[PDB]
Amino acid sequence: EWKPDEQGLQQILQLLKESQSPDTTIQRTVQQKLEQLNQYPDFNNYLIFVLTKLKSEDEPTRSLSGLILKNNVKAHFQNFPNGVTDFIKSECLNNIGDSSPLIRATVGILITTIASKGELQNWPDLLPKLCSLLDSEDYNTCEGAFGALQKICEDSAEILDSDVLDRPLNIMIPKFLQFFKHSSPKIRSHAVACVNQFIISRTQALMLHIDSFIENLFALAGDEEPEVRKNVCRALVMLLEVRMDRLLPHMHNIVEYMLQRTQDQDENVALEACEFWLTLAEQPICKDVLVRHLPKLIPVLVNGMKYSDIDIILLKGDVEEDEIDDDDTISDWNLRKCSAAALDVLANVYRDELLPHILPLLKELLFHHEWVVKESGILVLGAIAEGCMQGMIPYLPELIPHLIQCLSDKKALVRSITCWTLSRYAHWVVSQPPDTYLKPLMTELLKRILDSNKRVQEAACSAFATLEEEACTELVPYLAYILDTLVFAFSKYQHKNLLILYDAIGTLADSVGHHLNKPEYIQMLMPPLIQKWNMLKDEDKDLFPLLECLSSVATALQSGFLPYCEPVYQRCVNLVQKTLAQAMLNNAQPDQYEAPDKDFMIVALDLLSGLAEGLGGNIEQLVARSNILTLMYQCMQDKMPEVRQSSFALLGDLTKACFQHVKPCIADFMPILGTNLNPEFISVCNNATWAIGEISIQMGIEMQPYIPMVLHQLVEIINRPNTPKTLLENTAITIGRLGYVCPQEVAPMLQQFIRPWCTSLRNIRDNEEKDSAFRGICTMISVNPSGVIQDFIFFCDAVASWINPKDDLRDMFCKILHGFKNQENWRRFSDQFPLPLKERLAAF
């Protein structure tokens, strides 16, 4: 037992009363008084006392007392004395069934946070207490017990699944299932909500009972209560993903019931139902079980893709046309998003088979006079595009012109979704004669880039970037107009849209390439970019996209970038240097210095490597005057994989040109580069192989010692078929380059790498990397034919992969083929290939 003193109790009640004042100064001052009184050992005990024994006090005061006790728990429970902790536990369990739903909710969260803050083994009797209390004859105790149980199961599923308190679930799951029968709908909702927490974990206590679970779940399917239907749909989604075998016998009835729920009047029930279509489309059996239901399902999903009245109001689409929280509200998942995504995945799985069901609906929506219906039709046409392109093509000559008209529609929403749909059909648009569809499309899209409405602007920029990626060189005749409008966009845009504008400009540079290097384009594009570059300070996060954009420009312009190089270069160095400095400082004293944002040095290395790539030898007079070398060395010493990746990329680029200044540091680079290679941080390993290739081909025969330490690691990488194709291809390329410059160490290894070397390099398009790698393998076979006797078929395949190679490479292949045809076998090898490859071999 414990008792309060009257004056202290009354002072605490007065503070709780004053905590409800509208005056923020009163709130702050009484919060301060409370934070001070928290020092009192039994303050929390008075607080629970107000929550529980003073039934005479008004419910808001009691509720807030409970909530602030919950905060005190979360912050300080570890230093509560045992007496008050026991009082809290016992008393809140005594009042878990209090009449007021508000009091019962506060007590529920208080119990939940006590149990979560401590370990359940700090309160071992809690679960038996709640389980036994579920059997209450009084309703309120039962309801509160089950509510707190639901919260505990949601917060603490894993700890309940552990051996902690002797597998409690083994008794609870039979209990919860037994309460699916309960008369009160709220109790049934709690029961299903609790059981649902243990489906995805595949908890044995439940999976030992899935038959009873699904039987009672179907017995419960017909409930009137929206919460019950919500939780039943959620349970069936999870069970589909996990224990699909049991659901499969009843899949037809489950599908029909879940479609009925997809049409449910309550929006939450409908959303839960739509998740069923998304998850089912991911199971391999979907294309066989759901076909019979498509004619009933597609019209439903389509009908679900209309905006709700609430979305139309929030989007202000209702308004004539002559913010951040708006986005927060719209973006959040809803029935429209989910229906569109479900239709998208259904399109991906059924492809042309789904077209004859949706197309009659689509050709009604597209030309409907209600703008909401038209908008949903545009969204439908855009959603199925990716999966259904091959069957949709015949109608594009008819639809694309109307979509291009819709880009001029009065309603902003129609305009935006039209931009996105045309983006989805960009590839087919590009395939056609430019003057027929591409030029009108880009004209309208650029007119919308400067639209009045910001989401229209964002949609237009995204669509134009995708269209550029499809168009590539097709853009060049229109490049003046593209640049004019984009650089005008800088003068209009605002920060939220400015990053997608950067996306558009960077994509333009990437797709156009050296064609962008004209004086008018340079003096039109650069001034605003360097204006933003001067505007931003080194600490601004908005600097990440800009540099990520600028690098593209810098490479696309190649030497044309030179007048703007030096101030960029210098700053780009300083950034990484700073991030290194603080980083090591943070490593020395984490309390004195926080870990700096690695993204600055990552993007700085990326931009600097791209700058070296673009400028070639012209960057030598800068890197000679810089500490850059040491810095990137440290960047490859750093454990973080991204900086290692970026620094090896920069090493490769500074090796393509200006290697003469890198060379003295090779003795320091190579040991750590080879060491970093093998652990196979996929991107880091890939760049490490490629850097080894560059530095080896630069070094020549002088590379003697660095070959053994890398070659064993490289062939070990080739030993792993799990390597992604790019990494393995570059490993083979660098093996070839090493075999070219230093054969003697590679001489034993031909048999170990030639086969995957062939199967990888046969699919790279005859560039200088492939040229040097094949030169290397030719050198290797000339040095050791014995290593490829059992593998000449792979050599023939690799040599045949070349389409009209250089004359000297052709002669090397020719001479070595006429060599090992003598040194039947060559005829049989060439017979393994189709007419083209065999003919190429014969011509050689």
């Binding site: 973006s331 959040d332 998942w333 429209r336 998003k337 989910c338 569109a340 995504a341 998208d344 969204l379 855009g382 959603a383 979704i417 996105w420 983006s423 964002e458 995204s462 970037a465 995708t466 997608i500 996306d503």
Partner: peptide
């Protein structure tokens, strides 16, 4: 990598 879309799930 991929651009914003109309049916993108929060927490891409």
């Amino acid at each position: 990598m991929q651009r914003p879309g109309p049916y993108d799930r929060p927490g891409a």
